[PDB]
């Protein structure tokens, strides 16, 4: 399908639990790449921080990591997703089920 | 709300390479100069993030606080205290029944 649905969460073990990190429900194009998604996450996190500072009593804006994207495959293990892959290809190659695609993130380091 | 602002970069204290694009703003007369300075900081930061988002670069990053001025007679600009309400600024300094003209520059 030209459109793709994602359920996007912090990696369960590569990132510390954070009750402030909500599951994200995302629709984008199948032709979007993993690189677009990783860059999106960094931008979204920064936008949210800015808006949160805006509404807080802080007068100074302080305010940046790069992220790797993972998928849990049928084996239950995780695969690091190549940045050049389209989300369409990821769905066909690694997810293969008729459900919104569950993807995870953790910092590149 | 009821206070109307025509908000511009300080003509001289600018960074030449930056946009001079006038902003048109409405808010409550009870808003303070500190609210307006902070609003600017947030808006510029948001605009910069979205711009980087749309740029070809894969790497982002994290800037400044701002001083607010109003023009006065003659050929000068008066720095406005952050605690002043915008209503007070219009009555004290602007006076005329037109959208108020304010200016900004990074706080040195």
């Amino acid at each position: 399908a030209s459109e793709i649905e994602l359920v996007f969460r912090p990696h369960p073990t590569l990132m510390e639990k954070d009750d402030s990190a909500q599951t994200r429900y995302i629709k984008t194009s199948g032709n979007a790449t993993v690189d677009h998604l990783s860059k999106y996450l960094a931008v979204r996190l920064a936008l949210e921080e800015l808006r949160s500072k805006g509404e807080s009593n802080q007068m100074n804006l302080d305010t940046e990591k790069q992220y790797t994207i993972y998928i849990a495959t049928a084996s239950g293990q995780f695969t690091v997703l190549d940045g050049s892959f389209s989300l369409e290809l990821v769905s066909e190659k690694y997810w293969k089920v008729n459900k919104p695609m569950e993807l995870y993130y953790a910092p590149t380091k | 709300s009821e206070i109307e602002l025509v908000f511009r970069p300080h003509p001289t204290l600018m960074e030449k390479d930056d946009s001079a694009q006038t902003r048109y703003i409405k808010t409550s007369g009870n808003a303070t100069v500190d609210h307006l300075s902070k609003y600017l900081a947030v808006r510029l930061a948001l605009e910069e993030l979205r711009s980087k988002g749309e740029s070809n670069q894969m790497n982002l990053d994290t800037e400044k606080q701002y001083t607010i001025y109003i023009a006065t007679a003659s050929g000068q600009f008066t720095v406005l205290d952050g605690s002043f309400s915008l209503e007070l600024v219009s009555e004290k300094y602007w006076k005329v029944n037109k959208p108020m003209e304010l200016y900004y520059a990074p706080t040195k």
Binding site: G54, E55, S56, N57, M59 | S1, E4, V6, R23, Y24, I25, K26, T27, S28, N30, A31, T32, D34, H35, L36, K38, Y39, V42, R43, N97, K98, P99
Partner: peptide
Amino acid sequence: EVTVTDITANSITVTFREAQAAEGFFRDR
């Protein structure tokens, strides 16, 4: 057309609205 932003200072949150031109935004006087 109009951007809306809430900004807090001194435990008072103020709403700012911003447009790209005066006409159709600012009031008639």
